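Anyone up for a design puzzle?
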């Protein structure tokens, strides 16, 4: 035998170099077995100390039409650090979302007034009220 270091360098060379054993064992251990309940009330674990460190941010909806805005915002050039405070740069980009992040962004009322846009269809006199 190639007598030398019969200890596999304590912990194997690095991984295994098995190459491909057609092992269905794709996952690692924290796999999601047949879970038929989700929450139904009891979070099961409270859903807080699980550590996801994934996704990043896909629960807000970018709409895919704000980049142009971001382009401007940044094109203005003024806050290239936001380290000292970054307070002034937290009203616009924060308000354009505040008006919708509460529950609903729109609902056939983007204008708000509902009185303008000639929604009356010529409902105004001229002299005072057609009374001369």
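Challenge accepted. My sequence:
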């Amino acid at each position: 035998g190639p007598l030398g270091s019969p200890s596999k360098d304590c912990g194997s060379p690095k991984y295994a170099y098995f190459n491909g054993c057609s092992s269905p064992t794709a996952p690692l251990s924290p796999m999601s077995p047949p879970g038929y309940k989700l929450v139904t009330g009891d979070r099961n674990n409270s859903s807080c100390r699980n550590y996801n460190k994934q996704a990043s941010e896909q629960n807000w909806a970018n709409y895919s039409a704000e980049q142009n805005r971001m382009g401007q915002a940044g094109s203005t050039i003024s806050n290239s650090h936001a380290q000292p405070f970054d307070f002034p740069d937290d009203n616009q980009n924060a308000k354009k979302v505040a008006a919708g992040h509460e529950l609903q962004p729109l609902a056939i009322v983007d204008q708000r007034p509902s009185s303008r846009a000639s929604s009356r269809a010529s409902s105004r006199p001229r002299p005072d009220d057609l009374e001369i």
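A detail worth pointing out: The two ends are 119 Å apart (CA to CA).
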